[PDB]
Amino acid sequence: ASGLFTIPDGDFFSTARAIVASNAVATNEDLSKIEAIWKDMKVPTDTMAQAAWDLVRHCADVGSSAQTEMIDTGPYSNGISRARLAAAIKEVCTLRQFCMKYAPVVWNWMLTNNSPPANWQAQGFKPEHKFAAFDFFNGVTNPAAIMPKEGLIRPPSEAEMNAAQTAAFVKITKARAQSNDFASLDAAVTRGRITGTTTAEAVVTLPPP
Amino acid sequence: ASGLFTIPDGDFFSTARAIVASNAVATNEDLSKIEAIWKDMKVPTDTMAQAAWDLVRHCADVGSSAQTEMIDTGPYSNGISRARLAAAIKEVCTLRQFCMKYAPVVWNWMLTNNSPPANWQAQGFKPEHKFAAFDFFNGVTNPAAIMPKEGLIRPPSEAEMNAAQTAAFVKITKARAQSNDFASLDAAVTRGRITGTTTAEAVVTLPPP
Amino acid sequence: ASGLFTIPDGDFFSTARAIVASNAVATNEDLSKIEAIWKDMKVPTDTMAQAAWDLVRHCADVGSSAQTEMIDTGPYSNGISRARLAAAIKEVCTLRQFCMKYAPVVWNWMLTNNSPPANWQAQGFKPEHKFAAFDFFNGVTNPAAIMPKEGLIRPPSEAEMNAAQTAAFVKITKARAQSNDFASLDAAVTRGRITGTTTAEAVVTLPPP
Amino acid sequence: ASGLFTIPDGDFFSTARAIVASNAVATNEDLSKIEAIWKDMKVPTDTMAQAAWDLVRHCADVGSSAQTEMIDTGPYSNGISRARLAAAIKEVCTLRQFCMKYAPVVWNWMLTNNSPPANWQAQGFKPEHKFAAFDFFNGVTNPAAIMPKEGLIRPPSEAEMNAAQTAAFVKITKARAQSNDFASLDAAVTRGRITGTTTAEAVVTLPPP
C-alpha cells in the first residue's frame, strides 16, 4: 500500500502538527498586504499590532460590516483614523475576517476591564449574556485567530454561545429581509423595488418551540 | 511573531484602556459642532449642558424623530426655543443620536422625580414598564453616553428591556408600513402611490408564540 | 520532587495562613473603589464604616436586589441618602455582594437589639426562624466578611439555616418564573411576551417529601 | 502458557509497583506544561509549588469551574494574580483537574488552621460536615494526587463523604437544569431558548426515601 493508499502508522500522529488555517479568518497573505498598505500610510511599525487591536475593539462596539462607519482615532497610529485603517483592510479581505483574527484578544481585553460591547442592550442581549454581544464572537475559540500568551481569562459559557447564535440569526435574517431575491439589479427584473416584498411579509420571527 | 502577528502578553490587558466610541451615540466631533452653533445663537455656555439635558428630557416625552415638533422653551437657554436647539442639532447628527448621549442622565432624572415618559399609555406600555417608554432607551447602558457621577439609581429591569424591544418593533414596523418599497420617488415608479399597499395589507402584527 | 511536584512537609501547614477571599463577597479592590466615590460625594471618612453598616442593616429590612428602592437617610452620612450610597455601590459590585461583606455585623446588631428583619412575616418565615429572614444571610459564617471583634453573640441554628435555604429557593424560583427563557429580548424571539408562559404554568411549588 | 496467556506466579505481585495515574487528576505531562507557562510569565521557581497550593486553597473557597472568577494575588508569585495563574492552567487541563492534584494538601491545610471552605453555609452544608464543602473533595483519597509527607491529619468521615456526594448531585443537576438538551446551538434547533424548559419544569429535587 503506497501512493494515496498508504496507511498511517503512529509516527505521523505523534510528530506532525497541522498549522491551522481558516477561511473565516484573515489569512497570513491577507495580513502581510495590510501591513504594506498601513506602513505606506505611515502607521508606526512599533505599534502596528496595537493599532489593529484598538480597531477590532472598536469594531466590537459597532459592527464589522463593510458599511460600518468607524468613528475616531486610536492612540497607536500616528493620527490615522480608524475609518482609514478599515478602508485599507477592505481592499484586501473583509473587515469581519480581520476582526475574527483578533477575537480572543478583544475577548480578553473586555473581560479584564469589565467593559462589554457598547450596544449590547440595543442588540437585545440579556445582561448576563452581554459579553457575547459582538459579531465575530465566533472567532474567540477559532485556533487560526491570535491567542494571547497566557490564554483566555474565561472561556465563553454555553449560555453566551446560545445567545450569540440567536442574535446572529436575528441580525442576519433582518438584513436579508431588507435585501431582495432579484438575481439582477436591472429595472427589468426589480421593477423599481428594493425588497420586492411588503412590510408585513418581511417581518422576521424565530418560530416558537 | 511581529507586525500584525504579535501575541499580546498581559501587560497590554492590565494597562491599556479602550476609550469607548459608538456610532449610535453623538460623537465628540458631533458635540463640538453643536456647541459652536449653540453659542453663536447665544446659548449661555455656563448652562450649555443643562440646556441639552432639558431638551433630551423633553425628547423623552415626545419622540426623537427628525419630524418631531419640539414644544416649548427650557429654563437654561436665553429664551432659545427647543425647536431651534433641535434644528441646530439636526444639521450635525440625528436628534436620536444626540438624545442617546444623554440617556442615563434622563433615566436618572425620571427615576428621581418619579416622572415617567409622558405618553407611556398612548404607546401601549403597561404601568409596570412605563419608565422604558421612550425611544433612545437603548442608550442608558451604552458606555459612550454621559453617565452621571454617582451612577444609575436603578438599572433597567429585564421586563423593562423586554417591553422596550417590543415597542421598538411595533413603532418601527408601523412607520415602515406607512413608507413604501419604491427605490425611487419618481412617478414612473411610484405611480402616484404613497405606500403601494392597501390598508389591510399594511396591518402590522407581532405573530403569536 | 520539585517544581509543581513538591511534597509539603509540615512546616508549610504550621506557618502559612491563607487570606480568605470570596467572589460572593465584595473584594478589597471593590471596597477601595466604593470609598473613592463615597468621599467624593462627601461621606465623612470618620463614619464611613458606620454609613455602610447602616445601609446594610436597612438592606436586611428590604432586599439587596439591584432593583430595590432604598428609603431614607442614615445618621452617619452628611445627609447622603441611602439610595445614593447604593447607586454608587452598584457601579462597582452588586449590592448583595456589598451586604454579604457586613452580614456578621448586621447579624450581631439585630440579635443585640432583638430586632428581626422587618418583613419576616411577609416572607413566610415562622416566628422562631425570623432572624434568618434576610437575603445575604449566607454571609454570616463566610470568613471573607467583616467579623466583629468579640464574635457572634449566637451562631445561626440549623433550623434557621434550613428556613433560609427554603426561602432562598422560593424567592429565586418565583423571580425566575417572572423572567423568561428567551436567549434574546428582540421581538423576533420573544414575540411580545414577558415570560412566554401562562399563569398556571408559572406557579412555583416545592414538591413534597 | 506464554504471550498474553502467561500466568502470574507471585514474583510479580511482590516486586512490581504500579505507578497510579488518573484522568480525573492533572497528569505529569499536564503539570510540566503549566510550569513552562508559569515560569515564562515569571512565577518564581523557588515557590512554584506554594503558588499552586495557594491557588487551589482559594479554589476551595470559590469553585473550580472554568467560569469561576479568581479574586486576588497570593504571596508566593511575583505579584501574578490568581486569575492569570488559572487562565494559564485552563489552556492545558481543567482547573478542577489541577485542584484535584492538590486536594490532600488543601485538606490538611484547612484541618490544621480549622478554616473550612468559605461558602459552606451558602452551599447548604450542615456545620458538622462543612469541611467537605468544596468541589474536588473527591481527590483527597485519590493516590494520584499530591500526598503530604506525614499524611492526612484526619481521613474524611463517612458522613462527610455522604454530604459531599449529595451536594455534588445538587450542584451538578442545578447546572444541567440551566443548560439545555439541544444537540446544536443554532437557532434552527434552539428556537431562541436558553434551556427549552419552563421554571417549574426545571426545579431539581432529590426524591425522598
SS (H, E, C) chain A: CCHHHCCCCCHHHHHCCCCCCCCCCCCHHHHHHHHHHHHHCCCCHHHHHHHHHHHHHHHHHCCCCCCCCCCCCCCCCCCCCHHHHHHHHCCCCCHHHHHHHCHHHHHHHHHHHCCCCCCCCCCCCCHHHHHHCCCCHHHHCCCCCCCCCCCCCCCCCHHHHHHHHHHHHHHHHHHHHCCCCCCCCCHHHHCCCCCCCCCHHHCCCCCCC
Nearest residue of D to residue A125, measured between CA atoms: D192
CA distance C110 to chain B (A): 27
Quick count: other Cβ atoms within 10 Å of Cβ D9?
Answer: 7
Query: By the CB < 8 Å criterion, does D181 face chain A?
Result: no
Give the whole-angstrom CA distance, residue A167 versus residue A159.
12
Residues of A in contact with C196 (CB under 8 A): 208
Q: Which of B104, B89, B176, B93 is nearest to B138 (CA)?
A: B104
DSSP characters over D146-202:
---TT--SSPPPHHHHHHHHHHHHHHHHHHHHTS---SS-SHHHHSS-SSSS-TGGG
Give the whole-angstrom CA distance, residue B22 versus residue B44.
28
Packing angle between helix D103-113 and helix D48-61, nearest 10 degrees? 70
Q: Identify whether the C-beta of residue C20 lies closer than 8 Å to the C-beta of residue D74.
A: no
Q: Identify whether the C-beta of residue C90 lies closer than 8 Å to the C-beta of residue C98.
A: no
Contact C188 A174 (CB under 8 A): yes
> Would residue C3 be called left, alpha or beta, if left means φ above 0 and alpha means ψ between -120 and 50 degrees?
left
Q: Identify whether the C-beta of residue D39 lies closer than 8 Å to the C-beta of residue D55.
A: no
Distance of CA D116 to the CA centre of its chain: 16
Quick count: other Cβ atoms within 10 Å of Cβ B173?
Answer: 17
Q: Identify whether the C-beta of residue A136 lies closer than 8 Å to the C-beta of residue A96.
A: yes
- Cα-based angle A192, A198, A204 (whole degrees, multiple of 5): 125
Give the whole-angstrom CA distance, residue D135 versus residue D133.
7
DSSP characters over C180-194:
---SS-SHHHHSS-S
Quick count: other Cβ atoms within 10 Å of Cβ D10?
Answer: 7
Give the whole-angstrom CA distance, residue A107 versus residue D71.
19
DSSP characters over C21-43:
--SSS--HHHHHHHHHHHHHTT-
Grouping H, G, I as helix, E, B as strand and the rest as coil, residue B91 is: coil
Backbone φ and ψ for B170, nearest 5 degrees, come out as -65, -45
| Gyration radius (Cα) of chain B, Å | 21
* Burial of residue A159, with CB atoms counted within 10 A of its CB: 0-12 exposed, 13-18 middle, 19 or more buried: buried
Give the whole-angstrom CA distance, residue A156 versus residue A162.
10
Q: For chain B, what is the HEC assignment?
A: CCHHHCCCCCHHHHHCCCCCCCCCCCCHHHHHHHHHHHHHCCCCHHHHHHHHHHHHHHHHHCCCCCCCCCCCCCCCCCCCCHHHHHHHHCCCCCHHHHHHHCHHHHHHHHHHHCCCCCCCCCCCCCHHHHHHCCCCHHHHCCCCCCCCCCCCCCCCCHHHHHHHHHHHHHHHHHHHHCCCCCCCCCHHHHCCCCCCCCCHHHCCCCCCC
Amino acid occupying residue A59: C
Question: CA end-to-end span of chain A, whole Å?
Answer: 52
Q: Identify whether the C-beta of residue A111 lies closer than 8 Å to the C-beta of residue A147.
A: no
Q: Identify whether the C-beta of residue A162 lies closer than 8 Å to the C-beta of residue D187.
A: no
Q: Identify whether the C-beta of residue C22 lies closer than 8 Å to the C-beta of residue D71.
A: yes
Cell output for B172: 418601527
For residue D73, give the DSSP letter: -
Amino acid occupying residue C142: N
CA distance C146 to chain B (A): 25
Q: Identify whether the C-beta of residue C5 lies closer than 8 Å to the C-beta of residue C48.
A: no
User: Which residue in this structure is represented by grid cell 399594511?
Assistant: B202
Cell output for A147: 491567542
* Burial of residue D21, with CB atoms counted within 10 A of its CB: 0-12 exposed, 13-18 middle, 19 or more buried: exposed
Give the whole-angstrom CA distance, residue C81 versus residue C79.
6
Q: Which helix (H) or strand (E) holds C173?
A: helix C158-177
Contact C194 B162 (CB under 8 A): yes
Contact C188 A167 (CB under 8 A): no
Amino acid occupying residue A16: A
Distance of CA B42 to the CA centre of its chain: 25
Q: Which of B141, B208, B121, B133 is nearest to B165 (CA)?
A: B133
Cell output for A110: 473586555
Q: Identify whether the C-beta of residue D171 lies closer than 8 Å to the C-beta of residue D204.
A: no
Q: Identify whether the C-beta of residue D58 lies closer than 8 Å to the C-beta of residue D64.
A: no
Give the whole-angstrom CA distance, residue B195 versus residue B202.
9
Cell output for B78: 436665553
Packing angle between helix C82-89 and helix C28-40, nearest 10 degrees? 140
Q: Identify whether the C-beta of residue D43 lies closer than 8 Å to the C-beta of residue D80.
A: yes
Cell output for C70: 432604598
Contact C194 B159 (CB under 8 A): yes
Quick count: other Cβ atoms within 10 Å of Cβ A79?
Answer: 9
Query: Quick one: CA torsion of A64, A66, A69, A75, rounded to 10 degrees?
Result: 60
| Gyration radius (Cα) of chain C, Å | 21
Q: Which helix (H) or strand (E) holds C159?
A: helix C158-177
CA distance A11 to chain B (A): 29
Query: By the CB < 8 Å criterion, does B114 face chain A?
Result: no
Cell output for A2: 503506497
Give the whole-angstrom CA distance, residue D30 versus residue D100.
13
Chains with 3 or more CB pairs under 8 A to chain A: B, C, D
Residues of C in contact with B163 (CB under 8 A): 194
Query: By the CB < 8 Å criterion, does B169 face chain C?
Result: yes
Query: By the CB < 8 Å criterion, does D203 face chain A?
Result: no
Packing angle between helix D48-61 and helix D28-40, nearest 10 degrees? 100
Taken as a whole, chain C contains a residue count of 209
User: Which residue in this structure is represented by grid cell 444537540?
Assistant: D183
B57-67 burial by CB neighbour count: b if 16+ within 10 A, else e? Answer: bbbbbbbbeee
Q: Where are the domains of chain D?
A: 1-209
Q: Identify whether the C-beta of residue B137 lies closer than 8 Å to the C-beta of residue B166.
A: no
Taken as a whole, chain B contains a residue count of 209
Q: Identify whether the C-beta of residue C206 lies closer than 8 Å to the C-beta of residue C166.
A: yes
CA distance C96 to chain D (A): 13
Q: Which of B87, A114, A171, A163 is nearest to C33 (CA)?
A: A114
> Alpha helices of chain D — where are they, by DSSP H?
11-15, 28-40, 48-61, 82-89, 95-101, 103-113, 158-177, 187-190
Give the whole-angstrom CA distance, residue D86 versus residue D90.
6
Contact A149 D40 (CB under 8 A): yes
Question: CA end-to-end span of chain D, whole Å?
Answer: 52
Query: By the CB < 8 Å criterion, does B157 face chain C?
Result: yes
Cell output for B90: 439636526
Nearest residue of A to residue D92, measured between CA atoms: A151
Q: Identify whether the C-beta of residue C139 lies closer than 8 Å to the C-beta of residue C103.
A: yes
Taken as a whole, chain D contains a residue count of 209
Give the whole-angstrom CA distance, residue D91 versus residue D63.
18
Give the whole-angstrom CA distance, residue D138 versus residue D172.
14
Contact C18 D58 (CB under 8 A): yes
Q: Identify whether the C-beta of residue A160 lies closer than 8 Å to the C-beta of residue A131.
A: yes
Distance of CA C98 to the CA centre of its chain: 7
Give the whole-angstrom CA distance, residue D11 versus residue D20.
20
User: Which residue in this structure is represented by grid cell 472561556?
Assistant: A155
Query: In this structure, is the dihedral angle defined by the CA atoms of residues A50, A52, A56 and A59, taken in order, positive or negative?
Result: positive
- Cα-based angle D120, D121, D123 (whole degrees, multiple of 5): 65
Give the whole-angstrom CA distance, residue C31 versus residue C21.
13
Contact A49 B4 (CB under 8 A): yes
Residues of A in contact with D187 (CB under 8 A): 165-166, 168-170, 206
Grouping H, G, I as helix, E, B as strand and the rest as coil, residue C50 is: helix
Cell output for D200: 417549574
Query: By the CB < 8 Å criterion, does D163 face chain C?
Result: no
Nearest residue of C to residue D46, measured between CA atoms: C3
Residue C29 contacts by C-beta under 8 Å, 6 or more apart in sequence? none
Give the whole-angstrom CA distance, residue B130 versus residue B122.
11
Q: Identify whether the C-beta of residue B141 lies closer than 8 Å to the C-beta of residue B162.
A: no
Query: In this structure, is the dihedral angle defined by the CA atoms of residues D94, D96, D98 and D101, taken in order, positive or negative?
Result: negative
Q: Identify whether the C-beta of residue D121 lies closer than 8 Å to the C-beta of residue C142.
A: yes
Cell output for B162: 423586554
Which D-chain residues 6-65 have CB contacts (< 8 A) with chain C? 28, 31, 34-35, 45, 48-50, 52-54, 57-58, 61-62
CA distance A116 to chain C (A): 14
Query: By the CB < 8 Å criterion, does D131 face chain C?
Result: no
Q: Identify whether the C-beta of residue C96 lies closer than 8 Å to the C-beta of residue C65.
A: yes
Q: Identify whether the C-beta of residue B144 lies closer than 8 Å to the C-beta of residue B21.
A: yes
Give the whole-angstrom CA distance, residue C99 versus residue C61.
12
Give the whole-angstrom CA distance, residue D140 versus residue D149.
14
Give the whole-angstrom CA distance, residue C171 versus residue D139.
35
Q: Identify whether the C-beta of residue B20 lies closer than 8 Å to the C-beta of residue A62.
A: no
> Would residue C101 be called left, alpha or beta, if left means φ above 0 and alpha means ψ between -120 and 50 degrees?
alpha
Give the whole-angstrom CA distance, residue A15 versus residue A38.
38
Contact B20 A193 (CB under 8 A): no
Give the whole-angstrom CA distance, residue C96 versus residue D37.
36
